[PDB]
Design a protein around this motif. Sequence first.
Motif, PDB file in Angstrom:
ATOM      1  N   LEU L  27     -41.956  59.357  -7.563  1.00 17.45           N
ATOM      2  CA  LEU L  27     -43.384  59.072  -7.686  1.00 17.45           C
ATOM      3  C   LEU L  27     -44.212  60.350  -7.762  1.00 17.45           C
ATOM      4  O   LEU L  27     -45.127  60.469  -8.593  1.00 17.45           O
ATOM      5  N   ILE L  31     -46.701  61.644 -10.891  1.00 13.52           N
ATOM      6  CA  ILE L  31     -48.137  61.905 -10.746  1.00 13.52           C
ATOM      7  C   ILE L  31     -48.479  63.315 -11.221  1.00 13.52           C
ATOM      8  O   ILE L  31     -49.464  63.531 -11.950  1.00 13.52           O
ATOM      9  N   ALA L  71     -44.514  52.798  -7.539  1.00  6.83           N
ATOM     10  CA  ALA L  71     -45.208  52.583  -6.271  1.00  6.83           C
ATOM     11  C   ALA L  71     -45.209  51.110  -5.874  1.00  6.83           C
ATOM     12  O   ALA L  71     -45.030  50.775  -4.695  1.00  6.83           O
ATOM     13  N   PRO L  81     -45.597  54.112   0.056  1.00  5.15           N
ATOM     14  CA  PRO L  81     -45.764  55.281  -0.809  1.00  5.15           C
ATOM     15  C   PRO L  81     -46.860  56.208  -0.309  1.00  5.15           C
ATOM     16  O   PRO L  81     -47.715  55.834   0.495  1.00  5.15           O
ATOM     17  N   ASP L  82     -46.824  57.441  -0.809  1.00  2.45           N
ATOM     18  CA  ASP L  82     -47.798  58.465  -0.442  1.00  2.45           C
ATOM     19  C   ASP L  82     -48.083  59.320  -1.668  1.00  2.45           C
ATOM     20  O   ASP L  82     -47.258  60.156  -2.049  1.00  2.45           O
ATOM     21  N   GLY L  83     -49.244  59.115  -2.283  1.00  2.00           N
ATOM     22  CA  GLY L  83     -49.600  59.846  -3.482  1.00  2.00           C
ATOM     23  C   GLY L  83     -50.901  60.609  -3.370  1.00  2.00           C
ATOM     24  O   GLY L  83     -51.703  60.615  -4.306  1.00  2.00           O
ATOM     25  N   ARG L  84     -51.131  61.240  -2.224  1.00  2.00           N
ATOM     26  CA  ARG L  84     -52.345  62.016  -2.022  1.00  2.00           C
ATOM     27  C   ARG L  84     -52.226  63.390  -2.670  1.00  2.00           C
ATOM     28  O   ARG L  84     -51.128  63.889  -2.935  1.00  2.00           O
ATOM     29  N   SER L  85     -53.384  64.005  -2.922  1.00  2.00           N
ATOM     30  CA  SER L  85     -53.415  65.284  -3.622  1.00  2.00           C
ATOM     31  C   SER L  85     -52.725  66.386  -2.826  1.00  2.00           C
ATOM     32  O   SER L  85     -52.012  67.218  -3.397  1.00  2.00           O
ATOM     33  N   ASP L  86     -52.930  66.414  -1.507  1.00  2.00           N
ATOM     34  CA  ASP L  86     -52.285  67.431  -0.684  1.00  2.00           C
ATOM     35  C   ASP L  86     -50.769  67.321  -0.769  1.00  2.00           C
ATOM     36  O   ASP L  86     -50.071  68.324  -0.963  1.00  2.00           O
TER      37      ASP L  86
END
Lengths: 161, 160, 161, 161, 160, 160, 161, 160, 160, 160, 161, 161
Positions: L27, L31, L71, L81-86
């Motif tokens: 994932l 991204i 996701a 799921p984890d799709g953060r910018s950081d």
Amino acid sequence: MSARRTESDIQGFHATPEFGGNLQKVLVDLIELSLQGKQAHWNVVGSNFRDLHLQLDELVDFAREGSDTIAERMRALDAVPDGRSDTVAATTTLPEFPAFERSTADVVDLITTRINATVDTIRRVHDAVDAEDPSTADLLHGLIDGLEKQAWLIRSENRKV
Amino acid sequence: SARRTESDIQGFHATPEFGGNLQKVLVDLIELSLQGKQAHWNVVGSNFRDLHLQLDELVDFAREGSDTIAERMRALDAVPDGRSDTVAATTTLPEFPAFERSTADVVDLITTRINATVDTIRRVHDAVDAEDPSTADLLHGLIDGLEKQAWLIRSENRKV
Amino acid sequence: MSARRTESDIQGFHATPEFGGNLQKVLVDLIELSLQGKQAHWNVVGSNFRDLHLQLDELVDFAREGSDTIAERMRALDAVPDGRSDTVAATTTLPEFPAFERSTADVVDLITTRINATVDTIRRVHDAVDAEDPSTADLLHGLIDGLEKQAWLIRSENRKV
Amino acid sequence: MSARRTESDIQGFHATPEFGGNLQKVLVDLIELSLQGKQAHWNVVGSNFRDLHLQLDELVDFAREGSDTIAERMRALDAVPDGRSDTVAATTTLPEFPAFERSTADVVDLITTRINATVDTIRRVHDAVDAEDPSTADLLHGLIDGLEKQAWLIRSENRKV
Amino acid sequence: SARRTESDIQGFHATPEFGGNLQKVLVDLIELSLQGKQAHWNVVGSNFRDLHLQLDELVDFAREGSDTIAERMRALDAVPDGRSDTVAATTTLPEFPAFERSTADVVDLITTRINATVDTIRRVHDAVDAEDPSTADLLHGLIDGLEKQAWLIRSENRKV
Amino acid sequence: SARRTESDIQGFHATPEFGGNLQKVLVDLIELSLQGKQAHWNVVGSNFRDLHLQLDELVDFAREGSDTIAERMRALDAVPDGRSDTVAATTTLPEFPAFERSTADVVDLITTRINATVDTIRRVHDAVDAEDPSTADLLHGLIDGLEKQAWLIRSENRKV
Amino acid sequence: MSARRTESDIQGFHATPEFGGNLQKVLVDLIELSLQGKQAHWNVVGSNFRDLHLQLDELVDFAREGSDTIAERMRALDAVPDGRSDTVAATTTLPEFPAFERSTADVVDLITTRINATVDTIRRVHDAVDAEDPSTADLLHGLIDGLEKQAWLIRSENRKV
Amino acid sequence: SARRTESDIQGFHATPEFGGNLQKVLVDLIELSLQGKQAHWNVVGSNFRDLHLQLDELVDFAREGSDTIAERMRALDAVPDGRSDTVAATTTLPEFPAFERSTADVVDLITTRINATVDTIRRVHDAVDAEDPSTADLLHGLIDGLEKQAWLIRSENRKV
Amino acid sequence: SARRTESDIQGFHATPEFGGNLQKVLVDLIELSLQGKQAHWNVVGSNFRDLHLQLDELVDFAREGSDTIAERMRALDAVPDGRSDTVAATTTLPEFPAFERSTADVVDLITTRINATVDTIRRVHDAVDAEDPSTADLLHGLIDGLEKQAWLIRSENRKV
Amino acid sequence: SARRTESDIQGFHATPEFGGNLQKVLVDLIELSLQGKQAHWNVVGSNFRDLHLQLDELVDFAREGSDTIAERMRALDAVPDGRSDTVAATTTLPEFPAFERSTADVVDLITTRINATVDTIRRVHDAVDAEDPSTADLLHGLIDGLEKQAWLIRSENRKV
Amino acid sequence: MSARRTESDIQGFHATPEFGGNLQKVLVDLIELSLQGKQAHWNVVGSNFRDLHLQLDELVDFAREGSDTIAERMRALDAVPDGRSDTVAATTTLPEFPAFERSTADVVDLITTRINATVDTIRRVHDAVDAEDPSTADLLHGLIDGLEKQAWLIRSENRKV
Amino acid sequence: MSARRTESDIQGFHATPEFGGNLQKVLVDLIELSLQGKQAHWNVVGSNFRDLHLQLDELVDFAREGSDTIAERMRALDAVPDGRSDTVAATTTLPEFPAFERSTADVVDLITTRINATVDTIRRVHDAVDAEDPSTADLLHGLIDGLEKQAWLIRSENRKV
């Protein structure tokens, strides 16, 4: 205004009465074909009912579009069409369609015969129509192509090989 | 448990009076289609474009209605007859003039013929409903559509 | 072998004043329902906000189409409809909507009540309208069942079992 | 508030238990017809396979839509539909559909028989349903028309003329 | 890094004068919708069809604009009011005659009504734009659409 | 010139075990369709509209899946059997309650039944794949779709 | 055996300068007609305003498509079209359009004469164009009949009985 | 109530300077359309197809813009003039070469022409907006679209 | 005539402050798209479906807006920067929690984030508009869309 | 009453020379379709995407044309022969290379083959038209389409 | 940036020549199937003409899409497909299709035989293709499924039960 | 004759933490690929600019759809799921994209290498993902072949003879 024309009234192309009658014959035959197509569409029974039932509706749609095109061309060249029931019944050339329910073989034979008659009428008229107006000759070409394709698609069922 | 046993269940069959009434409707619808196309082609004058398009809408509706009636006739095991000779000999709509007509004349003629067509259906509806409400519904739909078309065509010549 | 009619001036069906008045009642209630539905669509807030928001818009669409159909039927039967704001406000029978933001349960209750009132009016009119003209009776049937479906879809949210 | 009604809770039409059972019969017959239509759609072989294969799918689509409409009307009038497999199997009236591959003539006869049975059920129920609610009678009219059209289109294959 | 350390950030709130001005716009749009439908139904005479269709287009545009203004009013946390009593008591458009009218009278009446509707928006625009250009753009769009419709309707009676 | 000569080339034939496993899948899909429609009709309470629409999507997916499986059965020269008596006698899904149910109960029931259907498919997949990977692919697609529907329906009642 | 050709550099049909000049005449008249049609579309006013407004837009669309087809044919035959404003203004043969607001009768007359002039130009060119390339003659036939139909639809407004 | 008691309400009328400025916009849009079609036909060389298609997109946009401006001029009761003599005698865009031109030259020419067209609108905008913000919005839209097309057509010749 | 005698005509060039302001808008739009997708995936609880769909609509709108701003930046001959490192190190929106959240928490978080995004644009608008009204118009459109989305998402938790 | 009597009305029948000429056209159309697919797959270099899409358009047109000619042959009661052995043995187009080719080579080859295909039609047109103008019209359409495709492909390598 | 890779040029998967030939066989059989499908589509006559005429067009469409997919996969894994007429005619394995008009039963038998031959070739190649690249094995699965469905739909006509 | 199950609380398939970690890797790479594709879409300039401009948009669309599918599969198997910018910036493996305006050849090379890196990650994960769940293995197959086709279409421009 170097090459511009100074004319205040420019007139269009006008068809002769022979031209009008030659298009009238095509018009009445197409209308009669539409009516007979709908009749055979309703009253057919027997084996392979569905395919013939649908092909006849396709034929009727094509004939209606063609007749409208011819009548609009007659108006465009400043002539007067006549598509009334009395005139169609009295002056059409297609043989009469029998009544009651008919099996599919009879319908195939009858429809092939009537399509061939219509195309024969168009072919007889095309010579003079083309000698006077190629733009109308082109419409006649299109009608001949469409009707012959429909005739093949309908008559091919009854062949024996 | 409660399933039937019969293997040859038959359907509803129409009477000859039913067939005659539906034939009377059908021939008038076909003749109306033909007259609508004629008036569509041969009209000239003011508001020519508007009448030109409205008559095409009317012809489309009439063709669809005639097909529905004929298909119902076959479904109830009767035989429709829509040949040119029969239509021209048995229709009740008055004959249409054969040359170019100004738009006022076309409006008057078309209103008259649509009124005649609707009168035929209103005359046969009593018996058709007394025998088959399902066909009565089709007659209701035809009446509604034709009356709306008549209003749209006839509203042009109203005085005030 | 010719049955053509001679009468050249054939007149259509004419509605009676009582017929016109009854259809007027139906029309004014439909317009008022449309206006109240839009109000409730804007000012609802709380839980299930999105669902109520979308359902009220669907109801408004249906009501608008129904009112247009009834008015066109009056015109087709040679009667004159009246859908002005003063007439609607002074003549309608639906109880008036509260002014401010309403929570979801209150809106559901209010809309159920007003839809029931509209359907009650149509049912009261149907007897005479059908005794005079079944073709209009059919339009009344269509309006009744559409509105009852919408009433079920809106009122079912708050029902507790 | 001149002509406005002051009622705070207006209730709708309620269906009687006889009305509910009369609609339940229609529902179960339509569901059984859908299942048998799919079975015949899968297992037909022989001459003219394709046309029957497609017509049966159209029949199944119509039956599914009609069943959904009837059940939604039942809910709209505060009645409870029951479309479970046990209930359908135990209480349906259509004769049982045979298994294995079946030639086209047998399938046509079977499907004509079962469509006629369904229409007979609807016609038996229509009298009381119309005496109570014309709006539901209209839905019954529509179902009868659709089913009879499909019956004609399917049975016309084996006619001998 | 540069992230903001807040938990609840407050939005833009409209003043009561802003709300009153947008209410003035909304009432006129609703009344225009109702009057347009009335004229659409009861017009009759020569050139009936074109007006019959143009009035439907005008009504559609008015309804969409009304919904846009009411949604903007809600977005800036104000309460719209579109009830029949309020519209009938507070609208500024002149009353519409109650019977069927010839086409010239309908054209004149509709031109006058659209002109009044646009005049209200032009009066409100300066005060709205002094606070919210985003709402000013919606007002610009409404003015443009209404003026084009007014031209298309009024061009019928010009004599030249 | 590497053309074949054989003029009676035969296709792949399924085994009785293959047919039995595919029948086991098919009856469960049909029963799931029927139960989905029942729950679609008879649900009341909060989030009624949302569950109303989601169950219709689930029923559509189940119908398409059952048709695909039955057509594969026919393509491999085996005979499906989807009659009501057979489904009612041989299905494995638990019986559905017969009255109106609040939305929480419907969510629980539908999650349980979708899980049962997916369990049946996963049980048969090993042998079906060891015999025909092309049918194993269809089973993979069915599993994926049903799991997504189960998530979308069950997520409403989660604790936090 | 094998009948494949060897010639690896095969050249196409090449148009003559007279062919190019004739197609240039057709192209410039079509462009001028498009511009005049748009002008008449904007500035017409009076009775039947909406109808004239819509018909002129249809005429402009058809003229634009025709000009693009002719120019693409000229390019396909290794000729170079010219569609610049100076060339169009100094070369076109259509009489110029009046500048201000015109009532609908005047616009109908003017547009009828201009369409007739364009069709006269195409008709004069068709003889040599067909003697050299019937494939282009066919495109000329299409343009002629489309333009005559549009001319009928516009000019029929002013005809008396 | 609050209804206004007038019978004929006058609208907003544009000044002759307003009409002149919008005429200046219209002439350049028409000339740009003609030059775009010319460059569409006569371009040839490497990367022919992309220019062949982008010029068609530019021509479509220019035609729509000129129609919108002329309709606005009519709506504010002014008279547009888009005749060939007027355009050829009063346009400000430089003349286009008359033969086959390679793609680099066409890119340069079209960039120059679009830049001149946008410069005219930028010069006219202040005076137009001082009177009619509603027309200022149309000018904003035209500037935006033309600048995007200029970027898409000029980017091919950049070297970096 | 009046034709201009130039060969290369220069266009409008944006200043570095203009570029920095539009960069500030762009970074926040991208971060909002990412956070919206995260909340769309991990929300759970009562009224799950409505938020699941509304967040997807919000993400679509944010993506289209960011693309429009970046294309405008390129059109005025500036260079955007939308890399992940830059977005993470320079965005101003508060960080999003990483597990499953109930619907009330998600509604509060998304309202806060959208309010921050709109506040950035409102801060930038005066300086952008003082130079380029055409870009000011795009900012107007973005503000309108984001406000409507915020209303639609926040209206669930209001109690009255 | 002028109806015909003949009940065995026969149609137009093509001559063996007619059939031979149409066969000559048909084999070349099929071979051109196959070569267009080959060149579509195996091209590399600059403008790769543009040639990739244009060759797909050409293949589509050729397939439709061959089908039209074959249906005309059947309609005039002649028997077409479009088998691979006959095509490979009797086609006249030069053989296509076997590996991946740069774009200039593909442009040259495709221009040559389209020119040969058009030459065959121009050779047979005289006799086909002297016998049947209705088929002459189809040949006109084929020539037009193929020549436009040839222009669009060959314009890439023109010098100036 | 702990996990970021510092590689400046990362290459992709490359297929072996055996893999290329194994896909080439599928390509040539699919092209030959398309050609024979069109031939049988044109030249069939007899009873139940229409249904077979349409099913053969569907078969041809599916075969064309499949061949395009296989050739594009072959290019994607950096191999060179060869779909020339000489290669297809010389190296195909499908038995030759007879000429002249053929009745419907003969066409059904011939098409069933040739579809079975194509599916047999794909099944033969699938083992090694899957042992090397599951992603391509998936495309082979899709082709097998589609072709077998078409074979059932065409062969079901001649079954006698 | 009744095989219905009794178990009323039936649980689904639960993924393992290693399964979740592998899908998380997939994932995050997708991204980051979407972000870099948009950057290259904006800042490319030079020859064939339009072609690369459109192709990069198509690639970005495909990547976005793929990431959403992965996701949603993670959620369906009850993992988070984890799709953060950081997280994306800290844990992605694709090399960082250059910042300023870049010619087309450089963009072609960069995008080819990044797509190859993404596909390599998917191939490294597929073995274990398939050993645990073939239904997810199928989604991995789809992603692999779509991305490889896009890589071919983008890299094929720079190939020499």
